[PDB]
């Protein structure tokens, strides 16, 4: 069990750690988060009390280094930092655990929610979507735009998700126009799975990461990307049976975890009604269709 310690909490902020969150008061004696489960990526995120504008945060994996947070009063945010000195950082942390100044990652033993939301998400792929190669962890916020968004403006601060476009030469074989537009299996299986992602785990990882950025940061381009990757599967007549079964589980847990009061902005009516009721896979997402119908029957 690993620890994301803090230098101090100089400004009042709501701190999120994965799907949990807690309020810290200005200058409250707070020195971090302990008992973080090893084996999963994590995200630690922030919303200042003064400026609910800009949710921001950091994706990280404690196996990859020792990470600590210090508030920067010039740039005005809580920054993640890595410490090479394994011995100095530990002595500072034990000291703090002794004084009980850390909150405990509050995982219920029965609960597999985080695993289920991050099953295929790996840090190495996060770091290729979020390009900042000098750090082991990745910053994301509400305002960052995607590569595809910048084609329709700072390339350094973009989310380099895989571009999906249903009316594009990549998506449509010359002479198969109607066939490929109405049945996207070619584009799913050959172009994206075999060609770009290599396997369905990497596809699902990007899909899960897009959802999490949409949910935790209100990142609109991430939300677009999540829906596009869902729609590409649902609009394919030919999908491996194991991918459909896993997609149903993935979406079920995303829909289960979504805040009930964010469903209006985070869910695209057209995509979901097409996917659950009109598409090739309308009958293949039993768990997802059942939770959607009992929790968000208005959208549909």
């Amino acid at each position: 069990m690993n620890t994301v310690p803090f230098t101090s909490a100089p400004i009042e902020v709501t701190i999120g750690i994965d799907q949990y969150s807690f309020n810290v008061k200005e200058n409250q004696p707070f020195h971090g988060i302990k008992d973080i489960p090893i084996g999963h990526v994590h995200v630690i995120h922030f919303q200042h009390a003064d400026n609910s504008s800009m949710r921001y945060g950091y994706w990280f994996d404690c196996r990859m280094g020792n990470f600590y947070i210090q508030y920067d009063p010039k740039d005005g945010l809580y920054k993640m930092m890595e410490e090479r000195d394994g011995a100095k950082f530990e002595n500072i942390v034990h000291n703090f655990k002794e004084r009980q100044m850390m909150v405990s990652y509050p995982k219920i033993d029965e609960d597999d929610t985080w695993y289920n939301l991050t099953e295929f998400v790996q840090m190495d792929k996060i770091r290729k979507i979020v390009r900042k190669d000098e750090n082991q962890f990745s910053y994301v916020d509400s305002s960052m735009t995607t590569v595809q968004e910048n084609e329709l403006s700072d390339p350094a601060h973009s989310l380099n998700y895989t571009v999906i476009n249903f009316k594009s030469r990549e998506a449509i074989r010359p002479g198969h126009e109607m066939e490929d537009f109405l049945d996207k299996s070619y584009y799913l299986n050959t172009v994206m799975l075999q060609g770009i992602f290599k396997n369905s785990s990497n596809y699902f990882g990007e899909l899960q990461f897009a959802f999490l950025n949409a949910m935790f940061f209100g990142n609109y381009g991430s939300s677009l990307q999540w829906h596009a990757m869902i729609e590409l599967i649902c609009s394919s007549a030919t999908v491996p049976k194991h991918m459909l079964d896993k997609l149903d589980e993935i979406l079920y847990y995303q829909i289960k975890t979504l805040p009930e009061q964010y469903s209006d902005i985070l869910l695209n009516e057209r995509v979901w009604n097409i996917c659950l009721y009109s598409s090739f896979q309308k009958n293949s997402l039993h768990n997802t269709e059942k939770i959607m119908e009992n929790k968000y029957p208005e959208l549909l």
Binding site: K167, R169, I172, E177, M178
Partner: protein
């Protein structure tokens, strides 16, 4: 974006554009089967692709053989239309290719857009106008060539005859749409108006009668009357 009454003069500027109407591509007669069920029998159709500035009509005849063994024909018809429009553009010299294609039905937008991906600089546009191009098969010579075709065929017409020698494009298009609106609202009477007499004939190389300027004013007046009436006869007013 979409084409409407506010930007109507844009049709007659010097950017090449084509209207594409697909309403006559997939045409059927509905009949009873011996078992008392209902069946369709397709008849020959056509794509109506029209330059509104020059009057040039590219009439692609759709022979019923193209439907053989195919499913969901109304959906295929839109994609067949887009394939043939795309083939037509590619056959034109670059300096003849359109800069915009306006589809009369919004369901043509995605099929044409996908077929024209090679042409990113050709704008595909809908329209809010209710253009009467479905009535093109009420033009006798157009109907005749469609129904006689035994194979896929493209036939080229000028739907304005020689009108541009005496009137502007805007005026010729207004005349065309008035003629077609009349034919669409009451074909018999529209056709009675146009050729019930002897001395105002159709040249072998024309579609419409050889009317003098004054005779066109009477004709146009009679078509307006028909259209207003049918609109009463329909709503009782």
């Amino acid at each position: 974006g979409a084409m409407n009454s506010s930007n109507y003069a844009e049709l007659f500027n010097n950017d090449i554009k084509l209207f594409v109407d697909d309403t006559n591509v997939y045409r059927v007669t509905v009949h009873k089967t011996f078992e008392g069920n209902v069946a369709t029998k397709a008849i020959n159709g056509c794509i109506f692709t029209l330059n509104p500035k020059t009057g040039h009509l590219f009439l692609k005849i759709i022979h019923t053989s193209v439907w053989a063994g195919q499913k969901r024909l109304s959906q295929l018809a839109k994609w067949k239309t887009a394939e043939e429009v795309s083939a037509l553009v590619r056959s034109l010299p670059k300096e003849e290719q359109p800069k915009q294609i306006i589809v009369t039905r919004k369901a043509m937008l995605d099929p044409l857009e996908v077929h024209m991906l090679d042409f990113p600089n050709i704008a595909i546009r809908p329209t809010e106008l209710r253009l009467p191009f479905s009535a093109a098969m009420s033009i006798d010579k157009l109907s005749d060539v469609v129904m006689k075709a035994t194979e896929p065929q493209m036939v080229l017409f000028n739907i304005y005859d020689d009108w541009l020698d005496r009137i502007s494009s805007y005026t010729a298009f207004s005349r065309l749409t008035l003629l077609l609106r009349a034919l669409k609202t009451n074909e018999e009477s529209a056709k009675m108006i146009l050729l019930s007499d002897p001395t105002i004939t159709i040249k072998s190389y024309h579609l419409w009668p050889s009317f003098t300027d004054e005779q066109w004013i009477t004709i146009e007046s009679q078509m307006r009357d028909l259209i207003l009436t049918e609109y009463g006869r329909k709503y009782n007013v």
